[PDB]
Design goal:
part of a larger assembly, 6 chains, A mainly alpha (about 130), B mainly alpha (about 100), C mainly alpha (about 150), D mainly beta (about 80), E alpha+beta (about 100), F mainly alpha (about 50), A: about 130 residues, about 5% strand, F: about 50 residues, mainly alpha, RNA-binding
Chain lengths: ~130, ~100, ~150, ~80, ~100, ~50
RNA sequence: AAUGGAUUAACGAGAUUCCCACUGUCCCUAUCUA
RNA sequence: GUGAACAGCCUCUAGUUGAUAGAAUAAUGUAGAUAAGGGAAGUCGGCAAAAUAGAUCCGUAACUUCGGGAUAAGGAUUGGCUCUAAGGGUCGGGUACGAUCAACUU
RNA sequence: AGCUUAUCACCCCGGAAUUGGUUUAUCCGGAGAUGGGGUCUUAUGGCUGGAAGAGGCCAGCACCUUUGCUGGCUCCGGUGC
RNA sequence: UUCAAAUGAGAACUUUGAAGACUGAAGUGGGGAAAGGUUCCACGUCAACAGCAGUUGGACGUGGGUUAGUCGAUCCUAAGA
């Protein structure tokens, strides 16, 4: 419709999205896969130096030091604090599947929550020790 | 009232382009100013006497120069070129009589 | 009733431009009889032609915007569009910093704080670097005078 | 114009037979903190220039106006 | 050092016409005069007295004739007495009031 | 040109006095075949060449 | 071969070919303003 | 005032408010724009338009007359508000300081 | 117009290695530096005379009027790539 | 570009007031050199001219107006005559 919004938000130039990124942090196995990708020729940092929050490859290990100390990367940390807004939140707002909704909110409060925060604590423990 | 006093002041000011006229050099008429104190609840008979005095001062005596020449006008009017007497309009100085 | 003659003429009398004089529309028969600057002096001071004081060009935003600039606001990378050298040249910084390091040594040598021989070593090392600022030099004077004492005591 | 310090030198100038007019000017000025005291200025018109004389006192100013010659046309303010 | 200055106001000409009263005017100063910030923070730095045509202000504080004209044009606007009352200096630090030109 | 010579100013004076319409009493003379001023000059129209 | 030839950094409103980025040139036309 | 700036945009003093006007809003024009999906398949030819653009930090190839190439290429960043830290001047010391005052720079 | 104000250059005393002085820019000194004391150029500033009597900003009265009249105040600092 | 009033036989165009905008001080501002020669200003006034209009005008008719011992010219020499 506009000029600026078409340039960044076409179907071709779509980023990953906020839904999958919360799944990648939520367990300890998918974190170790993305921190240790096999090196690929068709990827900007040759398949290393990948930030998990912002689905984005960096060129150099220097470009992670300057990326984490920025207001752009402190969006996505503050963005991924809570429940990740699935389809189930929108259905519960109309009076439809509360018990499917409230049980998932019960699990993010109990189980999935402190497993995520004990993963994001270890990323700052690791990305400061190597950089 | 607090909105009408704002909505009245929008047409009045127009400060961005030129000016507000100074009230010290402008003059009020009795006119609009006598109606304003009535809406505040002040009396006018204290101020009415000052108008009664000065309007007794200004009125006309009709001196003698305004007597004959109230309707009478154009005492010995000028010429076609509008010139003075000692101005010598060089076209019409040849023929003195106006029929020529 | 053409009044351009008195419009121009009253601007010459009061001493303001023609956009500022004000002829009342009510007394338009009295102004037309005035055809001389002697009449326009009389027509001003009795209350027919006035001055129309200055259109306001306030600076209350400028005094407010510049007030925040004293505190260190509006000074991130987004508000900068010229280089460091255009905003503050590298020679202007040097002239300030090096004339500090001269006239401190001028007033230590004349106060007896330091002898004339050790003045002439700190004078030329001030010309090159290894004295970053004023505080960074006074510590080196103390290290010099204590080690001059240290050589003298042994 | 010239400024004269002396009073004795000034009385040479009202008798020089070139000077025809003079004037006497009274000012109201201030000292350091003090009082508003009056200050006089005697002026004499020569041919080439205008000689003036500053007296801060009002007592000596009262005396010197008598000391002017009567033939000299003296103006007040 | 802190030598006070006497500021005098003559309110006679709209007092006698009845459009103005000094009584609410004298109270209007004493709470609205600001000393170093807040209103009513004055303690014995100003004094306000009125007479019926004379309003007298004595201040040892930072209080200037420009600010004394600032408060009275507030008070002549609240009572809607602007367009018809102006505040005029007669001598140094001595003030009075008047009307405008009512005349036709 | 505002810094003109007197040789130049002496010819503007003749050009000003020739800048007039025909007198109204020459209309009336006997055997007048002269009707209008024909060497009349305007400044906007025709330059007079110094 | 100073009728001058080979070479070559820098520079060019000089002449030609391609690759990424990009896009109504195009598939294919639609619409808004003066 | 913004800014590196006598750039561009906005205002005060001063100056103009002149250039034939009214009513309707078809085509084709002239000037200026935005387009889903694909991305030079258009065309003699990427003509034209789009994209890039200021500044700070990192980084920078063949080639060579060693001066250049170079802003090479390629990346991270840029608001607002509340703060911290660094960078000064003039004074009083017998033959180490303290007061006081003031600027926009990172 | 009167008094006063200077970077440079000059003069006298003095005789310097523990080379010193000094500009943002390294130039000078036994052909006499630093340092103590002096002389001139008056670019330019300061005070005063010119000169508040002028000019500026206001207030109060007068008055078809020629238009006048009478009072005030005209003060003191700050900073700069 | 707009509303009211004035003037006039007649007003989108003239004058004053009200209001809306622009040039935005490398101006649509204030002064000149070259060149023009009265265009400057007033009074009167609209047949022609201002590619519409006109009561307005750089138009038409009659006049008014440029004040120097110090600013220029005059004097000096340049390339050259």
């Amino acid at each position: 419709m506009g000029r600026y919004s078409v340039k960044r938000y076409k179907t071709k130039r779509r980023t990953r999205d906020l839904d999958l990124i919360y799944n990648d942090l939520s367990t300890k196995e998918s974190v170790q896969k993305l921190l240790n990708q096999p090196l690929d020729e068709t990827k900007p940092g040759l398949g290393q130096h990948y930030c998990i929050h912002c689905a984005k490859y960096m060129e150099t290990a220097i470009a992670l030091k300057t990326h984490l100390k920025g207001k752009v990367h402190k969006r996505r940390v503050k963005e991924l604090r809570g429940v990740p807004y699935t389809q189930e939140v929108s259905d519960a707002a109309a009076g439809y599947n509360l018990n499917k909704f409230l049980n998932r909110v019960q699990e993010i409060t109990q189980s999935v929550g402190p497993e995520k925060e004990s993963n994001e604590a270890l990323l700052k423990e690791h990305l400061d020790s190597t950089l | 009232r607090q909105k009408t006093m704002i909505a009245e002041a929008r047409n009045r000011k127009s400060l961005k382009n030129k000016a507000i006229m100074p009230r010290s050099k402008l003059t009020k008429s009795f006119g609009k100013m006598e109606e304003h104190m009535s809406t505040l609840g002040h009396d006018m008979s204290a101020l009415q006497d000052k108008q009664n005095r000065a309007a007794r001062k200004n009125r006309y005596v009709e001196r003698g120069s305004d007597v004959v020449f109230g309707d009478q006008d154009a005492l010995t009017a000028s010429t076609e070129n509008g010139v003075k007497l000692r101005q010598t309009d060089r076209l019409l100085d040849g023929v003195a009589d106006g029929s020529m | 009733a053409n009044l351009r003659t008195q419009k121009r003429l009253a601007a010459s009398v009061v001493g303001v431009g023609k956009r500022k004089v004000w002829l009342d529309p009510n007394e338009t028969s009295e102004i037309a009889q005035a055809n001389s600057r002697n009449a326009i002096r009389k027509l001003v001071k009795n209350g027919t032609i006035v001055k129309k004081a200055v259109t306001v060009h306030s600076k209350s935003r400028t005094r407010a915007h510049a007030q925040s600039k004293r505190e260190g606001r509006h000074s991130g990378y987004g508000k900068r569009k010229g280089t460091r050298e255009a905003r503050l040249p590298s020679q202007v910084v040097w002239i300030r910093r090096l004339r500090v390091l001269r006239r401190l040594l001028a007033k230590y040598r004349d106060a007896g704080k330091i002898d004339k021989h050790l003045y002439h070593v700190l004078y030329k090392e001030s010309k090159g670097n290894a004295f970053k600022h004023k505080r960074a030099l006074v510590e080196h004077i103390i290290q010099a005078k204590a080690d001059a004492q240290r050589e003298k005591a042994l | 114009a010239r400024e004269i310090t002396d009073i004795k030198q000034f009385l040479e100038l009202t008798r020089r037979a070139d000077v025809k007019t003079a004037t006497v000017k009274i000012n109201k000025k201030l000292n350091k903190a003090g009082k508003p005291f009056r200050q006089t200025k005697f002026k004499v018109r020569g041919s080439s220039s205008l000689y003036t004389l500053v007296i801060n006192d009002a007592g000596k100013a009262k005396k010197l106006i008598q000391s002017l010659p009567p033939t000299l046309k003296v103006n007040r303010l | 050092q802190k030598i006070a200055k006497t500021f005098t106001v003559d309110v006679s000409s709209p007092t006698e016409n009845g459009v103005f009263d000094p009584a609410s005017y004298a109270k209007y100063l004493i709470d609205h005069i600001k000393v170093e910030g807040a209103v009513g923070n004055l303690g014995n730095a100003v004094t306000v007295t009125e007479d019926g045509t004379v309003v007298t202000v004595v201040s040892t504080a930072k209080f200037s004739g420009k600010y004394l004209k600032y408060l009275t044009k507030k008070y002549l606007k609240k009572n809607q007495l602007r367009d018809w009352i102006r505040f005029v200096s007669t001598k140094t630090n001595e003030y009075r009031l008047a009307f405008y030109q009512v005349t036709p | 040109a505002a810094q003109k010579s007197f040789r130049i100013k002496q010819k503007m004076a003749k050009a000003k006095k020739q800048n007039r319409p025909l007198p109204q009493w020459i209309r009336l003379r006997t055997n007048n075949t002269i009707r209008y001023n024909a060497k009349r000059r305007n400044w906007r129209r025709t330059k007079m060449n110094i």
